[PDB]
Ligand binder design. Sequence first.
Ligand SMILES: O=C(NC[C@@]1(O)CCCN(c2cc(NCc3ccccc3)ncn2)C1)c1ccc(CN2CC3(CCC3)C2)cc1
Lengths: 239, 201
Amino acid sequence: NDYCQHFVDTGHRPQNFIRDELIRLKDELIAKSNTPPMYLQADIEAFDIRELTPKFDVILLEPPLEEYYRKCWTWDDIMKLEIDEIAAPRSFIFLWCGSGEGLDLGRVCLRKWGYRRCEDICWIKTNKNNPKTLDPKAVFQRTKEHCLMGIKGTVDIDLIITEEPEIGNIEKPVEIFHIIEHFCLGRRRLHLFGRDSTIRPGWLTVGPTLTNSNYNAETYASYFSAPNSYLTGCTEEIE
Amino acid sequence: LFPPQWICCDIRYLDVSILGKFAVVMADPPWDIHMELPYGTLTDDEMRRLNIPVLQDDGFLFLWVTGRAMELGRECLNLWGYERVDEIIWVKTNQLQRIIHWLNHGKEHCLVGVKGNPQGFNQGLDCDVIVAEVRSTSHKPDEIYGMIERLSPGTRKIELFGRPHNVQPNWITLGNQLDGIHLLDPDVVARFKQRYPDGII
Ligand SMILES: O=C(NC[C@@]1(O)CCCN(c2cc(NCc3ccccc3)ncn2)C1)c1ccc(CN2CC3(CCC3)C2)cc1
């Protein structure tokens, strides 16, 4: 059966018909390792990023693109972020890119801050509860977003399938956090452009819409002072 | 001439200028993806040097990428004069509709580049996600010919590095495992005889 034809016929995106412990202790081990959640309201355009210390093992960059809203950041603004200055020598980035120019401009950024792309994670949005308006350049209906993963220095698939959120809901699937956390990449984890609704144990959120802050660089670096500096986030805490 | 046509050859050495202009190009190149080779790869410069620009004036390029070709194909796609404007991903399932480095790969990507100013194309009929069963290895799903047909019906299309199961009405398949030359468009036949009078390329 041809689900591309079926979509031309009925409006059901092909992904709608994708079908369908053991790794559960690694979830407890992440949770035991997770630092207290930390959050800081900041206007990142006008905020000297270096103030965020120490260097991060993982950065999750979720800038508010105008394409999400059918204050927005252009790729002009994102590129000029000095991400290289707060990223640990060996470290990872997960960059939400949307589905338009970002799939290219986000790769420019990854190279600009000095990462090589190792993984292209697609969020495929089903429309099971509503069998869209197009971008001028668009050739097909765009039914997914891309989260690019970059590495610098020396269980899970690259897909997240969920139902298209309500128009004007800009949240990305929490599953990205599981994928990231199951990688065991370190505990200094930074979420740039989080919201109140994205604050999470084992993460530092920084964003303009945060209503409360609790960040303290000194308190923050104490979660990683010896003997905890090199943990993966997937091991038992040291006694 | 609507029915299938194909050319066994090496897209490196074939003078693609004889084939005229196409509404859609599709290419499934053997990128050197710094891994072990179960087929002859092309080098990055051989990739860059491919004479894709002569094939179109206004129309669409479809370009399968994987690994570091995701970046490199963006380079070739740009060098050849295309802007990337979409990107299809094919979700690989089995017969029961469940999905088949750092992550396990559940998909293959196909960049969509545009060139010139195409007009009269049915933009927005399909969506950028394919769900289709994996057949052989290195085997693109037939569904993409339907999306390309709806997008630009009746028009001339050309496929690079196709295999023999890929030969479709309205297409000309180029590949090194096809069974000789089979050409029906007379203008093509003419130019082919003119450029290759002794039949060898
Ligand atoms: O290569 C491959 N398959 C062997 C061929 O034989 C096949 C027939 C056509 N084909 C040439 C190759 C050619 N030059 C090559 C050459 C260079 C040096 C010495 C000998 C040959 N010229 C003229 N047709 C190459 C190949 C390419 C891409 C992929 C990956 N994608 C496939 C994918 C789409 C969806 C799944 C993703 C997998 C396999």
